[PDB]
Amino acid sequence: AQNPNCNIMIFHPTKEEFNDFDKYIAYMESQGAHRAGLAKIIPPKEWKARETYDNISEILIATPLQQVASGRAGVFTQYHKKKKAMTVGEYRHLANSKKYQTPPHQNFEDLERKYWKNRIYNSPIYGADISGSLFDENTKQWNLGHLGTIQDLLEKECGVVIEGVNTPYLYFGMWKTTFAWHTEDMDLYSINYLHLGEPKTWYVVPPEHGQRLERLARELFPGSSRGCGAFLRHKVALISPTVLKENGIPFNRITQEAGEFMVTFPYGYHAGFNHGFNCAEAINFATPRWIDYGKMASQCSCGEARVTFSMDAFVRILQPERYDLWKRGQD
Ligand SMILES: O=C(O)CNC(=O)C(=O)O
Ligand SMILES: [Mg+2]
Numbered sequence: 001a002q003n004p005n006c007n008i009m010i011f012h013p014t015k016e017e018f019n020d021f022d023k024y025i026a027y028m029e030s031q032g033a034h035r036a037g038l039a040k041i042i043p044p045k046e047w048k049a050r051e052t053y054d055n056i057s058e059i060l061i062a063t064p065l066q067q068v069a070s071g072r073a074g075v076f077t078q079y080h081k082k083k084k085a086m087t088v089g090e091y092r093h094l095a096n097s098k099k100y101q102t103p104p105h106q107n108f109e110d111l112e113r114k115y116w117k118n119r120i121y122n123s124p125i126y127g128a129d130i131s132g133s134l135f136d137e138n139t140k141q142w143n144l145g146h147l148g149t150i151q152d153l154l155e156k157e158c159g160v161v162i163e164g165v166n167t168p169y170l171y172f173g174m175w176k177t178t179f180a181w182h183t184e185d186m187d188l189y190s191i192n193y194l195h196l197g198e199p200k201t202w203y204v205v206p207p208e209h210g211q212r213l214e215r216l217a218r219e220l221f222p223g224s225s226r227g228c229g230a231f232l233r234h235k236v237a238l239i240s241p242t243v244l245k246e247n248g249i250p251f252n253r254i255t256q257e258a259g260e261f262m263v264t265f266p267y268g269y270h271a272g273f274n275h276g277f278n279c280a281e282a283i284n285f286a287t288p289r290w291i292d293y294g295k296m297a298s299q300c301s302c303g304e305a306r307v308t309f310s311m312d313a314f315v316r317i318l319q320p321e322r323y324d325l326w327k328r329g330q331d
């Protein structure tokens with residue numbers, strides 16, 4: 001069995017290997033990459049996403065979100081307070097302001113220590129889930145707006161034609177902006193490209209051990225767990241690496257830098273934070289191997305999770321027994 005310790009693997013495809021996306025995901029899995037829940041892919045030196053990032057300042061962040069924490073430094077939740085619209089140029093100036101800018105630090109490990117010590121005492125503002133793309137239309141390799149759609153994959157594997165679309169999303173981050181512990185909708189894959197700016201640190205639990213994380217989370221967030229049997233789908237809970245180690249939870253960590261892709265695998269729980277002003281693009285995707293994970297994905301039906309239009313068909317076809325309860329949580 002490849003990668004039995006579930007380490008995060010890093011890949012360096014050649015320009016030829018970068019042509020066929022599906023084939024390279026299957027190759028990474030042949031080497032055991034999915035066992036980690038997360039892999040890094042460094043593009044060949046010949047590749048670029050677009051020519052420059054000099055002309056992005058007029059993109060609008062319609063609903064910036066202030067991430068307000070509650071709890072203790074290593075075990076906390078966050079809620080998202082809506083703020084007034086602002087452009088990417090305005091957001092970049094805000095991220096660089098004395099109130100929000102990255103502090104002086106020695107290296108990534110020092111900054112990680114500072115994050116976990118001090119995150120809860122600040123409320124950073126995040127631009128999230130902005131439909132759009134920064135890939136040039138002429139970039140033919142690993143262009144996250146030109147991937148095969150999840151609806152087409154389901155139709156190819158299972159024969160059922162369904163409604164829905166699958167488009168990318170942009171993220172604009174600052175120091176201490178935080179992504180809570182979660183798996184993807186319907187335990188899909190994700191891919192994330194860091195277009196520009198400062199790094200993103202990731203934490204991940206191997207898919208084979210995800211239920212260990214879920215059990216700790218029920219212990220640590222006992223009111224939330226009573227409220228909903230899949231409350232991690234709410235995407236509000238944080239647990240630090242120190243707390244995970246104290247509780248024996250298997251996990252790994254890695255820092256993504258600008259120009260690098262990350263792939264998350266089905267049922268790989270992940271969380272992380274941004275180092276300073278940055279912009280990422282991400283989308284969900286599927287392969288044949290996903291279908292069995294989609295069929296078994298937990299679901300939130302309490303009302304909190306609310307998700308895209310295109311999840312309806314996935315639940316309807318893959319999880320007909322759960323569909324009526326889930327749709328009620330949508331309504
Ligand atoms: O960068 C982010 O805020 C979130 N990214 C992910 O959870 C992802 O691509 O799956
Ligand atoms: Mg612009």
Ligand code: NI
Binds near residue numbers: 184190264270
């Ligand atoms: Ni994710």
Ligand SMILES: [Zn+2]
Binds near residue numbers: 227229233301303305
């Ligand atoms: Zn719920």
